[PDB]
């Protein structure tokens, strides 16, 4: 599917069927998007929403989080699992207070330098909260791209990962980047699922190679 048709059909879908009312989409800031991205890395949206609300009520700004005791942060995280995320969350808050005056940094390199934030989470923060022109590549996005363009191979191998990032870059637009990047997460979460994807509900079904061959189970590849 040509890249301009990909982006236009995903944006047209999002306008009518996308999720726009999550709490970290209302009156968005870099801090709210970073906190939600870290909570969502390994947890389902319905479980995260009450934790996100409790964290924003107790820590309205990144400086408030930075100045709190780590034990208090770990107490409020209880139930989300994967506590290395919480330890790195507190460290990143401290890095923003210490190096950046309490204001979230707006360049790719400074965001990626934060503990617990890698290439995709950094692109997510800057595209979704400020409209900067970066693509993402979490597991939801990787599954949609690997099926639509038939990318076999384990994404654990560097050359396959590199191919998926080039494909993401190619289809991600500048105009509407915040809508597009959220829509790709929505598609992978709710429609292009690991098992038995709902292709009839997908705006890529007219150009997707996996749908044409009923071969979604091949993409992405599994570890050998
Ligand atoms: S048409 Fe089906 S396999 Fe292809 S991207 Fe959409 S849900 Fe995934």
Notes on the structure:
The PDB classes it as hydrolase. The entry lists the keywords DNA Repair, hydrolase. It forms a monomeric assembly. Crystal structure of the K142R mutant of E.coli MutY (core fragment). This protein has two domains: 1-20 and 133-224, Orthogonal Bundle (Endonuclease Iii, domain 2), CATH 1.10.1670; 21-132, Hypothetical protein, domain 2 (Endonuclease III, domain 1). The chain is built from twelve helices and no strands. The longest helix is centred in the middle third of the chain and has 16 residues, at 84-99. Helix content is 58%, strand content 0%. Iron/sulfur cluster is lined by residues 144, 147-148, 191-192, 197, 199, 202, 204-205, 208, 210-211, 216.
Number of distinct helices: 12
Q: Note the quaternary state here.
A: monomer
Which fold name corresponds to the CATH topology of the largest domain?
Endonuclease Iii, domain 2
Which architecture of the largest domain would the CATH scheme give at its second level? Answer: Orthogonal Bundle
Order of helices and strands: HHHHHHHHHHHH
Organism: Escherichia coli (strain K12)
Family: Belongs to the Nth/MutY family.
Active site: 37 (proton donor/acceptor)
Protein name: Adenine DNA glycosylase
């Amino acid at each position: 599917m040509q890249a301009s048709q990909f982006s236009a059909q995903v944006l047209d879908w999002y306008d009518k069927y996308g999720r726009k009312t999550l709490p970290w989409q209302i009156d968005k800031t870099p801090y709210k998007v970073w906190l939600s991205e870290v909570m969502l890395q390994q947890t389902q949206v319905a479980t995260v929403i009450p934790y996100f609300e409790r964290f924003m009520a107790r820590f309205p700004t990144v400086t408030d989080l930075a100045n709190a005791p780590l034990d208090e942060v770990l107490h409020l995280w209880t139930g989300l699992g994967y506590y290395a995320r919480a330890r790195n969350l507190h460290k990143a808050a401290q890095q923003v207070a210490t190096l950046h005056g309490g204001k979230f940094p707006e360049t790719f390199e400074e965001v990626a330098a934060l503990p617990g934030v890698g290439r995709s989470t950094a692109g997510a923060i800057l595209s979704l909260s400020l409209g900067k022109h970066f693509p993402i590549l979490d597991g939801n996005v990787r599954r949609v791209l690997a099926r639509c363009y038939a990318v076999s191979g384990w994404p654990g191998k560097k050359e396959v990962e590199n191919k998926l990032w080039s494909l993401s870059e190619q289809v991600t637009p500048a105009v509407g980047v915040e809508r597009f990047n959220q829509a790709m997460m929505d598609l992978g979460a709710m429609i292009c699922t690991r098992s038995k994807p709902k292709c009839s509900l997908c705006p890529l079904q007219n150009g997707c190679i996996a749908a044409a061959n009923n071969s979604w189970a091949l993409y992405p590849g599994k570890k050998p």
